[PDB]
Amino acid sequence: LVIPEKFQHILRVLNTNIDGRRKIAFAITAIKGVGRRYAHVVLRKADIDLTKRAGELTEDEVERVITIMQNPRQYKIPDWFLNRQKDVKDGKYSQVLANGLDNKLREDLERLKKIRAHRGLRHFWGLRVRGQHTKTTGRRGRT
Amino acid sequence: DKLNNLVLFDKATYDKLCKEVPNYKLITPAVVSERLKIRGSLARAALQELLSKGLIKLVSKHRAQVIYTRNT
Amino acid sequence: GHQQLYWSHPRKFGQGSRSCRVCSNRHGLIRKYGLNMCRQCFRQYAKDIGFIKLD
Amino acid sequence: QSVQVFGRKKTATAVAHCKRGNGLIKVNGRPLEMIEPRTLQYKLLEPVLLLGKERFAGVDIRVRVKGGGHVAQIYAIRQSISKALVAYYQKYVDEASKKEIKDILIQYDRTLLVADPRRCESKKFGGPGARARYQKSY
Amino acid sequence: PGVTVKDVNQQEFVRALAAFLKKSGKLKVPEWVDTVKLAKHKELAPYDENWFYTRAASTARHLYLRGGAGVGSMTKIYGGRQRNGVMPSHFSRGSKSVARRVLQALEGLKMVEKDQDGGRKLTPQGQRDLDRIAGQVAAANKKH
Amino acid sequence: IHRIRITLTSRNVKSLEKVCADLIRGAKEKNLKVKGPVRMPTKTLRITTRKTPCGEGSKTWDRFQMRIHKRLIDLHSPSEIVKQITSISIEPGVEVEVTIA
Amino acid sequence: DIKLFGKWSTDDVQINDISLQDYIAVKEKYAKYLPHSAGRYAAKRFRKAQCPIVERLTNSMMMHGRNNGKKLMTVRIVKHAFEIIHLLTGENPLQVLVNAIINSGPREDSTRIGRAGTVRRQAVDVSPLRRVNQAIWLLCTGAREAAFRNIKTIAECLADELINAAKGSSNSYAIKKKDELERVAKSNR
RNA sequence: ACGAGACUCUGGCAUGCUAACUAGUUACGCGACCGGUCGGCGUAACUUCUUAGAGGGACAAGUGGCGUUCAGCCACCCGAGAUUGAGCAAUAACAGGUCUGUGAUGCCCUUAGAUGUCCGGGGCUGCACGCGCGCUACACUGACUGGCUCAGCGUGUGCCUACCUACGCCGGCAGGCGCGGGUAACCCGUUGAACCCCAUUCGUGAUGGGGGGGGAUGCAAUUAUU
Questions:
Q1: Which superfamily does CATH assign the domain made up of C1-55 to?
Q2: How many angstroms separate the CA of E116 from the C1' of H166?
């Protein structure tokens, strides 16, 4: 017994018409700020019925999950547990996700590359900064 | 190299799972996903609902191996 | 002052100074059981202590 | 003083102390058919339908087990049970049907009376395991 | 024919102990179920939302089996191989703050009797109730 | 008190056997509630030593064994008798220690 | 007591081996129930003949690096689709098992002979032991390589490979590799 | 004659003998429903187990067969075992390694001008076939979460030694406040580590499958050693 109205082939939350074929709450892994533990805990604590079908999802579920990603404090996530915890420039604890400027907030590399620190002076030429021994190896993508 | 299945609601909602399957001698969720291009969630839900209806005989279960047949 | 003029540098992981004492070298030292002897003299004084080989 | 011939499979040793009883059997504070993997369930089932319940109705058997591995504990519990049954039922009552039951045992599986001799092999230096050597650089 | 804590298939024994105790409601529920990671070897959240009740059932069973099972022991029960990435995987225990919370749980519910020299023992009445749930699970399929 | 222990340790078997012969001779001198020797397991340590200082040739790890053997005896006896039995200019190579816990 | 597992009757079984049964003995007390008695027969010449086919096939399907040592899952995976062929055929699965096995052994093999001539080798008949062992190994290889990145699920595919080889149709991996090898050898005679 | 072998140890060998609750040892009204599971408790049981000193066993002697019917070889019946592994390992030599185990030894700066004494900065973590087992994992056999059930017989408190959390809690690790029971089979202990009846998910796809700031061992996290 399925819901016969409003049903869309595409599961739409963030206004980017990705393929809605994927089952519920598994398509939010592409957001640059919510992933791994955070995304999984906020779908598993959202009380979702993963045994439901694509044509039996309801507007209540999508509305509630939209509200839950809008509000970071739906279940009192700690600040050290928060995604943008004590980030540079400004300290914001609100769960906001929009294209155009979020990745620029993630781009705190401006300062590190400008002050030409040790990591910056490495990155001037494109040298590794995590100890990967690539003395002459590294043929993946370098022909 | 590419193969696509269907998770939409069509004749697969009722047909070939509510009245045509009992003609078989053995049912397997992989066989259902072969004959109808479905997923594991649908296979488990359909088996549970059909068993609640009462036309199916259990064999055993596993995380990826749950076996049933027909008896009516 | 005096603490920078001389000896402003310790070594608390020193193995070279606290090396195998009985001869004059650092290598060939394992810190179990208080060996303080190189493997060459380890064998030269093995059977004397009671060491035997069966494997 | 006592035989208590026990049972060993690999490093896992199980001993079955058998005395006068009702015929029920216990394995490590537990009856038999509740093994967690429950894939070798029939392996522990083997003796009871091999020799028959009419011989397992007058002897209380307690099994103690110790030794690593899931399967290694098995193949010794049943061996211990069988050999304890042979010992007890031989030392007291009769020898003809003793020959009968030991012959049935032998034709089904010789391991039920006599233990597996072969065990692990020590590792020698210069390689990962016992016989295997490291890769030669070239 | 009597009851035993392990005579039944222990799966349903422990499962029905946890279910019986959650429908009875005597045990309290913890305040945090996500802030802790429950294990060093685990890098993501559990998937029960009553795993505190599950762990309480597990530790009750394991204390029924062997007494003296003081803290520093149940931390190894859910611990296991830790994927250290490229490093070889060694045995690492679970986050013992959660085991400490379950230790807080047992204390004050009369579940365990402690002693100064280490260890803790189950109450005889507690094993009476454990034999009662054992009788329930036995009469479910084997004493029915 | 009647709680005195003696621990003897050596790497040789015949030495421990002659020490047990000393103890059984003392027990033959007078019958006392002295329990039998406690045979600790043959305690083995392995040591393994590369020989080629620089890498040149095979990986011949000299495998040497240090197998120490330990015997215990706990005695409830007058001190003088066992002291005379024991302090009899004991054999070299076997180490004996008397403990009162 | 005298039947397999207490369910598979061993009394009214089929002959089905004329004289290949000297290799495979599943028709007397020499037929143990479970396909697990530890690998203890691989210590002398021809003790493999004593070993039941089931245990040998269970041991074999545990290879390819991804199945190194883990055997209880192999026993589970064979008992599954053992039940499938059993209930699809309705009778004791022994006949269909043996049919699948004996339809897969390569009838002849092109062994390289000659001093330095690799352009013509000899097509010789294959021994029953080598035939059956290669058949089992190659069908298990086909089952595994039909399970990685493949829409089919392992522990069910081998049932269809078994029934197909028992019937003999060319869809199966084992009989098709055997037939291609046979045609290569026929070129070589 | 040396070497091979025998020889030594090692899993098979307490199916009988040397015998400690500190590791284990059926008997001993209680606890549990009223006769059957707790390893927390009691014949100080006169040690079968895993704790081991002696002694024993197997030898191609048994049978059949092959062999120029000798040395021997194969199969079979037996037996714990009808070839278990290592240990010791020629005469002579390589123009081998080690003075970087060493103040005896081929040596122009070795007239105490510095390689460390005293400093540790940049790196063998810098890039192109460029010689190096070191590459766990690499997905529906399995990755998740835990319902879950099993000896390392590796070993872990040191004359000028100082680096191995019970009882309660704040915590993602350590951090501790007295505090890791012990110089050890006493204290880590019946060292619940590993394929498993899955305890939500991932029914065929590169995807759920390896996967830039900080709170803190040492004098200084650095190309995230940790």
A1: Ribosomal Protein S14/S29 (4.10.830.10)
A2: 9
